[PDB]
Amino acid sequence: PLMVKVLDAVRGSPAINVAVHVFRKAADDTWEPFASGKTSESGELHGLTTEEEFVEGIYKVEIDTKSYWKALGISPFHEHAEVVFTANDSGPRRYTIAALLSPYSYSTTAVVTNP
Amino acid sequence: PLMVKVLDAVRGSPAINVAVHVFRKAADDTWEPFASGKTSESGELHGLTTEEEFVEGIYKVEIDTKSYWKALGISPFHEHAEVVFTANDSGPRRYTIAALLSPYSYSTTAVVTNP
Amino acid sequence: PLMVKVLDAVRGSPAINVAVHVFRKAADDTWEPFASGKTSESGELHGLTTEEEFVEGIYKVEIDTKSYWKALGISPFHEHAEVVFTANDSGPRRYTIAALLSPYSYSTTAVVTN
Amino acid sequence: PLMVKVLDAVRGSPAINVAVHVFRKAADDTWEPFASGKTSESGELHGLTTEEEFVEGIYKVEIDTKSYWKALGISPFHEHAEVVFTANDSGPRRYTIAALLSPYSYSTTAVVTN
Ligand SMILES: Nc1ccc(/C=C/c2cc(Br)c(O)c(Br)c2)cc1
Ligand SMILES: Nc1ccc(/C=C/c2cc(Br)c(O)c(Br)c2)cc1
């Protein structure tokens, strides 16, 4: 129900081994850790959560773009790329969060489907 | 060896039934029709060409964004989104051309892999 | 030293009257309010800070995109857009944080000049 | 009535000294030269046309991104970036075509205002 895909605009490639952390806003307004993982060789991160676990809420997907760039030997501008959204509030949906990275820029889009 | 994927930034969905035309620059500097098709329900267009057919050259991928938006009842800014690039000049590669559409904007990226 | 510019990809216009908050990362890793305002008719927000006040560190620029889209009657995806970056004195002196908004997407870039 | 602004997503800067050609679509569907120039230190290209000369029709803005990246020693994907649009008198009067460049990607938006 939640997939993250990351691409590299410099190399024209998937962004591999990118760390991703997902948080969910708690009742006390803090960000509770929800799930995390690493993008694969395809730039995709599968298996973050389950339909059971992925309840309604406000979620933050933090993509650790700085660590990615530094590993390639590049000093980038941003610390991370964030995506903050309400999920599943009209029932379960499937979300893909895609991000396209450059050293001084990023872009993100959501693909939301109703199974 | 050549795949086109198109997403809708307004709807948060694949861009379905988007017409795509591919041209190749001829010896006389004109744009020769090469291949064409329509994106599927996934926003993907597969089967445009073959490794045999897809020789070195300068290719133009024209995504008919205006027709897409007009079909949804929207008057968009651009006539089409173009992607013009040299392909296969250091041997066969696999190219994905991805585009993300809004009524007054688009973005495109290439994912190039060496099989 | 810090300007924010916001554009609307749906209407093909500056994004006008958008609330923007800037935070600075504190020692305890919390986000402390630093500066804020609303974009002008040109989509720009000037006068956030001064050379004196804007020191090296980690900053977060939060753009209230959800209110923006609601006010235009358009259904949005994100709660807000965030841009988190380090200000570095060895690079150029003036930072422009630009954002391009769609309902289910946004893009941001930095234009850092002297 | 027509301005072009180009930014560099790799360096976080305006894209300076980039060649830009504008064409207008002719009756025979061919592309006729209309205006051209090079971006300034701010990444902007002003003075392309006048209100008088800029009539409704289909225009193509070609940005020579390949030369730009080559001059910086960076390997590029695209031959050029294109932006093809219709000028419509029922909409606002001033058009800004903005482009954000990376080696394997670009983004473009229109800012159309009165
Ligand atoms: N600017 C901008 C922002 C995001 C994107 C997404 C590309 C994208 C490519 C593949 Br292939 C794919 O499977 C998915 Br899902 C998404 C492109 C351009
Ligand atoms: N993805 C994407 C596409 C386009 C842009 C444009 C940024 C932009 C910056 C400044 Br300063 C300016 O004056 C104008 Br007019 C436009 C940003 C991100």
Nearest residue to C94 via CA among D99, D42, D10, A76: D42
Q: Report which DSSP code applies to B53.
A: T
Atom of ligand 2 nearest to the CA of B105: 3
CA of D33 vs chain C CAs: smallest distance (Å): 25
Q: What are phi and psi of B93, to 5 degrees?
A: -130, 165
Test B100 with A107 for CB contact under 8 angstroms.
yes
Atom of ligand 1 nearest to the CA of A3: 15
Nearest ligand, CA B42: 1
Q: How far is the CA of B110 from the centre of ligand 1 (A)?
A: 9
Among A10, A77, A100, most D C-beta atoms within 10 A, so best to mutate, is A10
Maximal C-alpha separation, chain D: 44
* Structure tokens belonging to residue B2: 């050549």
Chain D partners within 8 Å of A103 (Cβ)? 9-12
Contacting partners of chain A (3+ CB pairs under 8 A): B, C, D
Place of tokens 């006539």: B79
Residue B47's identity, in one-letter code, is: G
Nearest residue to C42 via CA among C20, C64, C63, C14: C14
Minimal-distance CA residue of chain B relative to C100? B105
Residues A72, A78: contact at Cβ < 8 Å? no
> E strands within B9-65?
13-14, 19-25, 31-38, 44-45, 57-63
Q: Of C100, C104, C107, which has the smallest distance from its Cβ to B10's Cβ? A: C104
Nearest residue to A23 via CA among A69, A78, A87: A87
Q: What are phi and psi of A47, to 5 degrees?
A: 80, 20
Nearest CA to ligand 1 atom 9: B98
Helices (H), A46-104: 65-71
Test C111 with D9 for CB contact under 8 angstroms.
no
Among A97, A101, A111, most B C-beta atoms within 10 A, so best to mutate, is A111
Enter the CATH code of domain D1-114. Answer: 2.60.40.180
Nearest residue to A115 via CA among A58, A56, A51: A51
Q: Hey, what's the torsion of the CAs at A18, A24, A29, A30, to 10 degrees?
A: -40
Nearest CA to ligand 2 atom 7: C98
Residues D2, D49: contact at Cβ < 8 Å? yes
Residues D86, D56: contact at Cβ < 8 Å? yes
Q: Is D82 labeled as ligand-binding?
A: no
Minimal-distance CA residue of chain D relative to B111? D104
Chain D partners within 8 Å of A77 (Cβ)? 12
DSSP run (H or E) holding A59:
strand A57-63
Q: How many CA atoms lie within 13 A of A83 on its CB side?
A: 32
The alpha-carbon radius of gyration of chain A (Å, integer) is: 14
Question: How many beta-carbon contacts under 8 Å exist across B and C?
Answer: 37
Minimal-distance CA residue of chain B relative to A13? B111
Q: Report in angstroms the alpha-carbon separations of B45 from B50, C110, D92.
A: 14, 33, 36
Does the Cβ of D55 fall within 6 Å of ligand 2?
no
* Choice from D78, D105, D106, D108 to test ligand 1 binding pocket (greatest atom count within 8 A of CB): D105
Number of neighbours of residue D33 by Cβ within 10 angstroms = 9
Residues C17, C74: contact at Cβ < 8 Å? no
Number of neighbours of residue B79 by Cβ within 10 angstroms = 20
Nearest residue to A108 via CA among A81, A87, A89: A81
Atom of ligand 2 nearest to the CA of D96: 15
Separation of alpha carbons C15 and C8, rounded Å: 5
Experimentally determined by: X-ray
Q: Report in angstroms the alpha-carbon separations of B110 from B9, C16, C18, D1.
A: 18, 33, 32, 32
Chain C residues at the A interface, defined by Cβ less than 8 Å, are: 58, 77-80, 82-86, 102, 104-110, 112
Strands C78-87 and C19-25: unpaired
Tell me the β-bridge partners of A38.
A19
* Structure tokens belonging to residue B78: 């651009």
Residue A24's identity, in one-letter code, is: R
Q: Report which DSSP code applies to C90.
A: T
Separation of alpha carbons A38 and C109, rounded Å: 24
Minimal-distance CA residue of chain C relative to B106? C9
Nearest residue to A108 via CA among C102, C90, C91, C110: C102
Does the Cβ of B19 fall within 6 Å of ligand 1?
no
Quickly list DSSP for C4-17: EEEEETTTTEE-TT
Separation of alpha carbons D82 and D108, rounded Å: 9
Q: How far is the CA of A99 from the centre of ligand 1 (A)?
A: 7
Residues B61, B49: contact at Cβ < 8 Å? no
Resolution stated for this PDB structure, in Å: 1.4
Chain D residues at the C interface, defined by Cβ less than 8 Å, are: 7, 9, 12-14, 43, 98, 100, 107, 109-113
Query: Distance between terminal CA atoms of chain A?
Result: 9
Pick the CATH number of B1-115 from 3.30.413.10, 1.10.10.10, 3.20.20.10, 2.60.40.180: 2.60.40.180
Question: What are all long-range contacts of B79-82, with beta carbons under 8 Å and residues at least 24 apart?
Answer: B79/D58, B79/D84, B79/D85, B79/D86, B80/D84, B81/B106, B81/B108, B82/D82, B82/D84
| Extents of the domains making up chain A | 1-115
Separation of alpha carbons D111 and A52, rounded Å: 44
Separation of alpha carbons D106 and D21, rounded Å: 17
